[PDB]
Amino acid sequence: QSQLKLLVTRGKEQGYLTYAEVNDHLPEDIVDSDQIEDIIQMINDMGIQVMEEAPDADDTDPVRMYMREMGTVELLTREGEIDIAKRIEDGINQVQCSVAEYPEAITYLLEQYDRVEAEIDPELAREKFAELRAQYVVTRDTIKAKGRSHATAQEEILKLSEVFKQFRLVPKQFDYLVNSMRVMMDRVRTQERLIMKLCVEQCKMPKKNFITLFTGNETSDTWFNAAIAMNKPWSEKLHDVSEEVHRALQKLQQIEEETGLTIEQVKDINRRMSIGEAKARRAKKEMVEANLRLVISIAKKYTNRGLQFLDLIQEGNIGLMKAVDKFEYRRGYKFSTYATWWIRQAITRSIADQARTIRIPVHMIETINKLNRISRQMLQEMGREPTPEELAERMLMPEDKIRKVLKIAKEPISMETPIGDDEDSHLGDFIEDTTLELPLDSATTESLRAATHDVLAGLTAREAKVLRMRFGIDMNTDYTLEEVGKQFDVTRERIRQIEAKALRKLRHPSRSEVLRS
Amino acid sequence: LKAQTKTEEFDAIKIALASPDMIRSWSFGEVKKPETINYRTFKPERDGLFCARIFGPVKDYECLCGKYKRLKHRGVICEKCGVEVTQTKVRRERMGHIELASPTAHIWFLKSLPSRIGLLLDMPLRDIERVLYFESYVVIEGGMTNLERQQILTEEQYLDALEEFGDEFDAKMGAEAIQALLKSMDLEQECEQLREELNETNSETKRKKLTKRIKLLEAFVQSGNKPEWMILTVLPVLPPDLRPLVPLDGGRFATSDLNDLYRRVINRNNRLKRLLDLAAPDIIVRNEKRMLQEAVDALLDNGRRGRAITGSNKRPLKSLADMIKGGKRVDYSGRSVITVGPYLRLHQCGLPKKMALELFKPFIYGKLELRGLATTIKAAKKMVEREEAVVWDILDEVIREHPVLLNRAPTLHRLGIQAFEPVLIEGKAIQLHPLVCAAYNADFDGDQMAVHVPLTLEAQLEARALMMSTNNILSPANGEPIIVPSQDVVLGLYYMTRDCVNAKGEGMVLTGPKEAERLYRSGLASLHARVKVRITEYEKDANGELVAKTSLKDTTVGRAILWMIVPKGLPYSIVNQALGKKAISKMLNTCYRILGLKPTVIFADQIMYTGFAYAARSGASVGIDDMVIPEKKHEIISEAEAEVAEIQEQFQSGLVTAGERYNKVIDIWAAANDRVSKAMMDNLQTETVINRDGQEEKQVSFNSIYMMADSGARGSAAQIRQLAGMRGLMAKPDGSIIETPITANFREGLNVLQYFISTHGARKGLADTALKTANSGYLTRRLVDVAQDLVVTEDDCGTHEGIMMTPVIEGGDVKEPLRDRVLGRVTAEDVLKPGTADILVPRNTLLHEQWCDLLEENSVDAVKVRSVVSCDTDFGVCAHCYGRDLARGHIINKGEAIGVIAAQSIGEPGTQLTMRDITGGLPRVADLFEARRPKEPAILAEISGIVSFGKETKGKRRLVITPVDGSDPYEEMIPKWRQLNVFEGERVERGDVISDGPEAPHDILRLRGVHAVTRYIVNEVQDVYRLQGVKINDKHIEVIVRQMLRKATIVNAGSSDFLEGEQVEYSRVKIANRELEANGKVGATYSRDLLGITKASLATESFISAASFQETTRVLTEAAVAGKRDELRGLKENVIVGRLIPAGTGYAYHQDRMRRRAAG
Ligand SMILES: [Mg+2]
Ligand SMILES: [Zn+2]
Ligand SMILES: [Zn+2]
């Protein structure tokens, strides 16, 4: 209504395209560089019909839209934070315990420790790793002996779990193990999904019957042969997949032998590990989400230094994202300051490198800044400009080192810079090419080839080839006195004699003489 | 069995979307690091924007590390670093790519006027498509319950709808969401259903959007491109050399902005990839995804939304698009200040020694090593670098018959660049022939011209047979001569006539040449007396040849000797009996039409030599006493100031209307200004007394000043009138006239007051000069942009129709005839004769045969003539239909270039057009070409009927006229404002005036007729050239009117789809091939449509041509959406690609290659 009626009725056709008119007759926050092109495009060119395409098309900023979603405060207190931190540690512990439940994680760590000793106290390493192995070798025997039907035998197993929980492993280790377990489960559900896909769909066996049957042993062929011997209409199709199901069951039993665990529970421990993963990850996200403010507030100080506001607060978010990982609620120190340093270090270790087009090392950045900080006083604590010799004297570095440092400063300049302000100048337009050769130079080089190719004609074969092969022309790889002396029987001095005689010949022709210059 | 897989000859170029895999095909690696060059070694990083393994090696043949150096390994890559060691120019052509994590929207197909990705999907641009991909309002992707298919949901709406149903309508948000949206879209099935629904019981209340999108949707699907490619997943990288960082002088590198861009996009992209592996907070990752969007959009095309700054420059960064959106320097060139050279011929120019030496450097070298002298090539360089006497003679050899073409700064028309034969001159200035000094519009104020050396063999022949000045005798605009003698020479030949009585006169008779001995040997004068001599005339008739005719005529000394110069033919004596003024050129023209080129050319050199010599002999000067004031000056001024005095006294005592006494006293001074002007002219004109035999007689003043004015040579009435008469009414900055004209004159003193008044005139004179000079070219660009594609082709077609040419007669109430507007015109068909027979069918009205159109008396003043307005040609122009008017005398050579020559001639005299029921001036010319409706358009009767009022002001309304007769009515709308011209009941014809006001060309063409509208445009555009007094042929106006009526609009039912306004090119060629194909009922009847220069030029086949003038960001985009291809006939687009021009010296080339592209 308002915009549509005002625009159309006014512009008929405003003669000289009065741009500075209806743009004031438009709502919302003005002075934008977005709404501009959307009016210059309609007015002319495709007139009449373009003015009907406009209204039907009418029937913004990164940072402002970022603060919008950050607007969801959900701020915390000492109570709130510690609560989140408690859930983090809670999630983590269940994961490790779920890992400790895994016997192959202990046995692999054992296997890899023997690898370590086969090539941080070495005796201390031999100490704890001995403790683990000891509890293992005592727990392992209480398995097949079956004494204490996994009640007290279970006690030594969980004691072995605690012993494993004593170990403070490296991040790469825990991730490798956990990844390995999920890969194992991937093979497990691979076989389970294979049996299901083969028996349920290919053999027309209802999902009700498959869940009622397979859920039992899942490994022994006691369920498969009982499914075939059920004399159901979907039982006769199983014969066409007997080898497949058998092959899948045999491989799953193989996994039982690999983990040394009950297949009807590997899902259970893996389940609880996954749960903990979601729990801890969740809390850490809530953590990074909550202290999201702290990032921007401290990143505002580092603004404008060869990197935009969005980039700064982004590294501060990854800077904050790391801080939340290394922190415990069982610490007198609060999160408000501990995170701040990690964020400061995060973006400052980004402004250092990914800022200028040319590379630069951190010590360079610190040295350069120190120079400026020192120079701002020398011209103010005296009265005249800071001389390079004296300024270098006020520093540990000599002087020439400082000179070379200034040759790394600035982006530097971009070619698209106007210079003489012609119609229209650009610095990069004055830049001459030097890698190209003058057509004059190229022409002479060709005539030079002709010159030499024609001069070696007025020579003998045992002299032309000699001159040609020695200085390596028209044959790429040039040879020496020996490699030419061998192919011509007489060695060294003889061939050099001829080589000098050919040079003697070229003392009257003027062609190569003028070609010299 | 061809199928060659190399870089051979191409017949066309195609433009279309690029698949992510399409980009991968160009990829010679993947940029993965924002790193550019090393901080210390100044060496290309591993996988940065300037890799050596990816793109190309720095040095020519040596690899990065240095394991391989010389030409030994030009095909094998290095062991330590995969560096293909070939050239360094490889670094100038290699592509490369970056592969982003989450998808990114292409800024062009996103926000470029019509949202392509939106209109294709039917969805709002900066409204819905923004809030849906900036992570704000999630969108749907097809649902079989509750939710439609493309509605927009908030987080709250999303989870609510998900809780109700969910897991069966999944619909993401952001970039990849629009991807699944564009991907899921079925162009095929929608193209069917859209055709079904948008045709069912709907009038003109829907057909708009209906026809639009269905044509668009049909286009894209047939284009070949999959809408998947709209938003890219793989963004390709520009070759390093096209955006280098080259060390300037003493450090301080200089880079392009793209490095800033590419470095930002990579950094933002990698952080995105790194975050898609670490903890992924939805707010953090989504923001980084929006930042990648920012980075990519900025690199492709800044525009547009804030402009990414940085780079320390407060100025924005030059993105890719901005580097191709909106001059051609050349080798073998030079320039210098020009100077007149009287001793030259008409095909010769003075080219400086040192200038010509450095210009033909490559030719001197070759000829030197050719002859001997130089042992080798480098010997020659050292030989000419040490300008060694002998070298100059060899220079005299190479420039012998090697034409060099000259050029001046403001090149308005074809005669801006003309070829000459190089003449060595000891000097550092360039000399020019004083005849072609007018074609260039060049003066010797310090003006400087450029020179070019036709290197190519045929490029020399192009220069000799076309651009050579001797072939440009006549003006391309008007048939009259262009190299006609100017100021100095013309006063020369005027002084060679001008019969003066007695004074060493007497009628001592002889025989031509002997008189020359008489003039040098004194005794007799030269401007006497008259005197008689024997004139041996030569004339031809019927069987041509020559017929002598010796006689005894009464010429003068000047006329006798001047007769020697005159060529073999010609009427003789009578051409010299007159004088030297305008006939000075008239003589030259007639000689050309009755003789030919060469006799006319040499005649010009001779008439040039004659004028200068005898003018120098004459010695006309300008002392202060040459500009005599009339004695009645002070008398007339007092009388005028007496009259105006009486009027002011009347205004004092009421009586006369004081409101406009200003106007009437101005007439008094204006009359007063004319009185002095007439008095000064009548006095300075005749005067003199002489003393013939018995004394007492009168001729015309030999007052030098007068002689110059009575013989062209920059001397007009107004200027003279200011010299001795008075500067009349002067303008005031207000625009009003001062009521106290400058009574004094330049001969006299000028008061400080009246000069401070005249200063305004000069300021607004120069300033107005400055505007119309640039505004002239501003018009020419539009003229050419629309016309520079049509060339006279298919020889000479049939057809007889064409505008009935008749003498432009304002003589209805003012008397002003002009009947030369038919000559070199091809006849329509035997245009009658008060009796029988006479004129043939296709016979072009000769220069001598139009003079035969006076032997048929003043009776015959109407002839039908073939014009470019008509001509049933297809994509060109019939040679017959055109004419002949060139510097050449015959009809236009087949495959010329009518358009550019037409535009040039029209926009050339724009320099002498004053901008403002009469607009007048250059602006008036513009409006007629733009075909704009007047501020008060008149109205016409569409169908002939009986006039009656249609409900007196019953709407709305505003009067209503309804001319109904025979069958069916019409209701025109009169807005009360402005009266009428036909009472009720009266009958009208098909297109009668019922507003008696300004006519609209749109209505005229639409109703009156094509011949009518073209006749209107030509006769109305000429009317603004009459007043300015600039002669320009009607053909060229007709030529631009030709493709000014290029397209039309079809109204019925055919293979073409109705509402579409298509050009009569495809229309006629398709309607001719449908009457005899299957049925004429599968085709409709079309209707010519008037569109202005710009609106017409806007439409053109080549997408490359369009990207020249109009908004490249738009044209390249839309031409990309549909798989379009230029192939490849236009002039402009075939120039930027840098190949043979499909006309003139080419044409033959294009025709052969045009037919060649018929096998497949
Ligand atoms: Mg000048
Ligand atoms: Zn190498
Ligand atoms: Zn024709």
Find the DSSP H helices in A166-262: 171-196, 207-214, 224-228, 242-259
Q: Sign of the CA dihedral A18, A24, A30, A31?
A: positive
Residues 6+ away with beta carbon under 8 Å from B661: B647, B648, B650, B651
Hey, which bits of B322-383 come out as E strands? Answer: 333-340, 348-352
Residues in chain A: 517
A432 touches B: beta carbon within 8 Å: no
Other Cβ atoms less than 10 A from the Cβ of B553: the count is: 18
Tell me how far apart the alpha carbons of residues A92 and A94 are, in angstroms, rounded to a whole number: 5
Secondary structure class of B211 (helix, strand, coil): helix
Tell me how far apart the alpha carbons of residues B984 and B962 are, in angstroms, rounded to a whole number: 10
Element (H, E) at B448: strand B448-452
Residues 6+ away with beta carbon under 8 Å from B864: B800, B801, B802, B803, B804, B805, B827, B828, B829, B831
Tell me how far apart the alpha carbons of residues B483 and B433 are, in angstroms, rounded to a whole number: 10
Please tell me the distance between residue B65's alpha carbon and the centre of ligand 2 in angstroms. Answer: 5
Q: Are B405 and B417 in contact (CB under 8 A)?
A: yes
Q: Two tokens at B540?
A: 């031809």
Phi, psi (degrees; rounded to nearest 5) at B391: -60, -40
Q: Two tokens at B731?
A: 């303008």
Resolution (A): 3.8
Please tell me the distance between residue B69's alpha carbon and the centre of ligand 2 in angstroms. Answer: 8
Q: Are B231 and B174 in contact (CB under 8 A)?
A: no
Residues 6+ away with beta carbon under 8 Å from A472: A478, A479
- In DSSP terms, A348 is beta-bridged to none
A17 touches B: beta carbon within 8 Å: no
Other Cβ atoms less than 10 A from the Cβ of A411: the count is: 20
Q: Sign of the CA dihedral A104, A105, A108, A110?
A: negative
Phi, psi (degrees; rounded to nearest 5) at B246: -90, 130
Element (H, E) at B554: strand B547-555
Tell me how far apart the alpha carbons of residues B1112 and A371 are, in angstroms, rounded to a whole number: 49
Q: How many CA atoms lie within 13 A of B45 on its CB side?
A: 18
What string of DSSP letters covers B397-435?
HHTTT--EEEE-SS--SGGGEEEEEEEEESSSSEEE-SS
Q: What one-letter code names the amino acid at B728?
A: G
- Encode B399-437: b = buried (16+ Cβ within 10 Å), e = exposed: beebbbbbebeeebbbbbbbbbbbbbbeeeebbbbbbbb
B305 touches A: beta carbon within 8 Å: yes
Tell me how far apart the alpha carbons of residues B480 and B887 are, in angstroms, rounded to a whole number: 9
Residues 6+ away with beta carbon under 8 Å from B823: B479, B845, B846, B847, B850
A288: nearest CB among B268, B279, B304: B279
Stretch 251-310 of chain A: residues touching chain B, C-beta under 8 Å: 281, 284-285, 288-289, 292, 306, 308, 310
Structure-determination technique: X-ray
Residue whose C-alpha is closest to residue B263's, from A353, A317, A409: A353
B830 carries a ligand binding annotation: no
B378: nearest CB among A358, A414, A514: A514
Residues 6+ away with beta carbon under 8 Å from B173: B132, B133, B135, B137, B138, B139
In Å, how far are A14, A106, B355, B1095 from A43, measured between CA atoms? 10, 75, 52, 13
Q: What one-letter code names the amino acid at B1029?
A: G
Please tell me the distance between residue B447's alpha carbon and the centre of ligand 1 in angstroms. Answer: 5
Find the DSSP H helices in A302-334: 309-323
Please tell me the distance between residue B443's alpha carbon and the centre of ligand 1 in angstroms. Answer: 4
The separation between the first and the last C-alpha atoms of chain B, rounded to the nearest angstrom, is 13
Cis amide leading into B1128 (omega within 30)? yes
A437 touches B: beta carbon within 8 Å: no
CA B351 to chain centre: 31
Instruction: Find the residue in A nearest to B365 (Cα).
Output: A440
Which residues have beta carbons under 5 A from ligand 3 (an ion)? Answer: B 797, 871, 873, 878, 881
Q: Two tokens at B1007?
A: 């109703």
In Å, how far are A40, A396, B141 from B120, measured between CA atoms? 23, 67, 15
- Encode A297-332: b = buried (16+ Cβ within 10 Å), e = exposed: ebbeebeeeebbbbbbbbbbbbbbbbbbeebeeeee
Tokens 């042969």: give the residue.
A225
Residues 6+ away with beta carbon under 8 Å from A42: A50, A51, A53, A54, B113
Residue whose C-alpha is closest to residue A66's, from A354, A346, A309: A309
Q: Sign of the CA dihedral B1051, B1055, B1059, B1063?
A: negative
In Å, how far are B844, B845, B852 from B849, measured between CA atoms? 9, 6, 5
Residues of chain A with CATH 1.10.220.120: 1-59
Chain B positions in Cβ-Cβ contact with residue A346 (cut-off 8 Å): none
Secondary structure class of A202 (helix, strand, coil): coil
Q: After which residues is chain B broken (C to N over 2.5 A)?
A: 326, 916
B246 touches A: beta carbon within 8 Å: yes
- Encode A71-99: b = buried (16+ Cβ within 10 Å), e = exposed: eeeeebeeeebbebbebbeebbebbbbbb
B224 touches A: beta carbon within 8 Å: no
Helix, strand, coil in percent for chain A, rounding step 5: 60, 0, 40
Please tell me the distance between residue A477's alpha carbon and the centre of ligand 2 in angstroms. Answer: 18
For the purposes of burial, counting CB atoms within 10 Å of the CB of B2, is it exposed (0-12), middle (13-18) or buried (19 or more)?
exposed
What string of DSSP letters covers B73-109?
GSSSBPSSS--B-S-SGGGGT---EEEEEEEEE-HHH
Stretch 58-77 of chain A: residues touching chain B, C-beta under 8 Å: 58-62, 65-66, 69-70
Tell me how far apart the alpha carbons of residues B899 and A510 are, in angstroms, rounded to a whole number: 58
Q: Are B969 and B951 in contact (CB under 8 A)?
A: no
Class of domain A436-517: mainly alpha
Residues in chain B: 1160
Residues of chain A with CATH 1.10.10.10: 355-435, 436-517
Helix, strand, coil in percent for chain B, rounding step 5: 40, 10, 50
In Å, how far are A398, B501, B703 from B577, measured between CA atoms? 98, 15, 21
* Beta strands at B430-432 and B333-340: parallel, antiparallel or unpaired: parallel
Cis amide leading into B304 (omega within 30)? yes
B631-763 is classed in which CATH architecture?
Orthogonal Bundle (1.10)
Cis amide leading into B264 (omega within 30)? no
Element (H, E) at B588: helix B583-594
Cis amide leading into A424 (omega within 30)? yes
B797 carries a ligand binding annotation: yes
Element (H, E) at A129: helix A122-139
What CATH code would you report for A355-435? 1.10.10.10
- In DSSP terms, B1126 is beta-bridged to B13
Instruction: Find the residue in B nearest to A427 (Cα).
Output: B254
- In DSSP terms, B552 is beta-bridged to B534
| CA distance to partner chain A, nearest, from residue B259 (Å) | 8
In Å, how far are A413, A415, A424, A425 from A421, measured between CA atoms? 17, 14, 6, 5
CATH superfamily, region A60-354: RNA Polymerase Primary Sigma Factor (1.10.601.10)
Tokens 């839309």: give the residue.
B1118
Q: Two tokens at B1061?
A: 């306004």
B500 carries a ligand binding annotation: no
B259 touches A: beta carbon within 8 Å: yes
Other Cβ atoms less than 10 A from the Cβ of A432: the count is: 6
Ligand showing the shortest atom-to-Cα distance for residue B62: 2
For the purposes of burial, counting CB atoms within 10 Å of the CB of B1135, is it exposed (0-12), middle (13-18) or buried (19 or more)?
middle
Which residues have beta carbons under 5 A from ligand 2 (an ion)? Answer: B 63, 65, 67, 78
Instruction: Find the residue in B nearest to A410 (Cα).
Output: B252
B65 carries a ligand binding annotation: yes
Residue whose C-alpha is closest to residue A505's, from A478, A448, A466, A450: A466
A34: nearest CB among B208, B290, B305: B305
Angle, helix B257-275 to helix A309-323, in steps of 10 degrees: 20
Other Cβ atoms less than 10 A from the Cβ of A464: the count is: 15
Tell me how far apart the alpha carbons of residues B685 and B724 are, in angstroms, rounded to a whole number: 13
Q: Two tokens at B504?
A: 């060493």
Q: What one-letter code names the amino acid at A466?
A: V
Q: Which long-range contacts (CB under 8 A, 24 or more apart) does A339-343 make?
A: A339/A291, A339/A294, A340/A294, A340/A298, A343/A294, A343/A295, A343/A298, A343/A299, A343/A316, A343/A319
Tell me how far apart the alpha carbons of residues A510 and A504 are, in angstroms, rounded to a whole number: 14
A·B CB contacts under 8 A: 179
Tell me how far apart the alpha carbons of residues B1142 and B639 are, in angstroms, rounded to a whole number: 70
Rg (CA), chain B: 38
Residues of chain A with CATH 1.10.601.10: 60-354
Q: Are B923 and B768 in contact (CB under 8 A)?
A: no
Q: Which long-range contacts (CB under 8 A, 24 or more apart) does B165-169 make?
A: B168/B143, B168/B144, B169/B140, B169/B141, B169/B142, B169/B143, B169/B144, B169/B145
A444: nearest CB among B38, B291, B378: B378
Instruction: Find the residue in A nearest to B366 (Cα).
Output: A443
A69: nearest CB among B248, B254, B283: B283
Residue whose C-alpha is closest to residue B452's, from B483, B480, B419, B428: B419
Stretch 1085-1104 of chain B: residues touching chain A, C-beta under 8 Å: 1095, 1098
B852 carries a ligand binding annotation: no
| CA distance to partner chain B, nearest, from residue A38 (Å) | 6
CB contact under 8 A, B72 and A415: no
Fill in the DSSP letter of residue B932: P
Please tell me the distance between residue B88's alpha carbon and the centre of ligand 2 in angstroms. Answer: 15
Q: Are B737 and B731 in contact (CB under 8 A)?
A: yes
Tell me how far apart the alpha carbons of residues B506 and B44 are, in angstroms, rounded to a whole number: 97
Torsion angle in degrees (nearest 10) through CA of B64, B67, B71, B75: -80
Angle, helix B1010-1028 to helix B922-930, in steps of 10 degrees: 170
Q: Sign of the CA dihedral B249, B252, B256, B262?
A: positive
Q: Two tokens at B643?
A: 């009259």
Q: What one-letter code names the amino acid at B235?
A: L
CB contact under 8 A, A42 and B267: no
Tell me how far apart the alpha carbons of residues B242 and B1038 are, in angstroms, rounded to a whole number: 46
A443: nearest CB among B257, B303, B377: B377
Residues 6+ away with beta carbon under 8 Å from B351: B399, B404, B422, B423, B424, B425, B430, B431, B451
Tell me how far apart the alpha carbons of residues A99 and B220 are, in angstroms, rounded to a whole number: 56
Give the 3-state DSSP-derived string for B1006-1037, with helices as H, strands as E and coil as C: HHHCHHHHHHHHHHHHHHHHHHHCCCCCHHHH
CATH superfamily, region A1-59: Sigma-70 factor, region 1.1 (1.10.220.120)
Fill in the DSSP letter of residue B825: P
For the purposes of burial, counting CB atoms within 10 Å of the CB of B1142, is it exposed (0-12), middle (13-18) or buried (19 or more)?
buried
Residue whose C-alpha is closest to residue B740's, from B759, B758, B724: B758
Other Cβ atoms less than 10 A from the Cβ of B989: the count is: 12
For the purposes of burial, counting CB atoms within 10 Å of the CB of A500, is it exposed (0-12), middle (13-18) or buried (19 or more)?
exposed
Q: What one-letter code names the amino acid at A506?
A: L
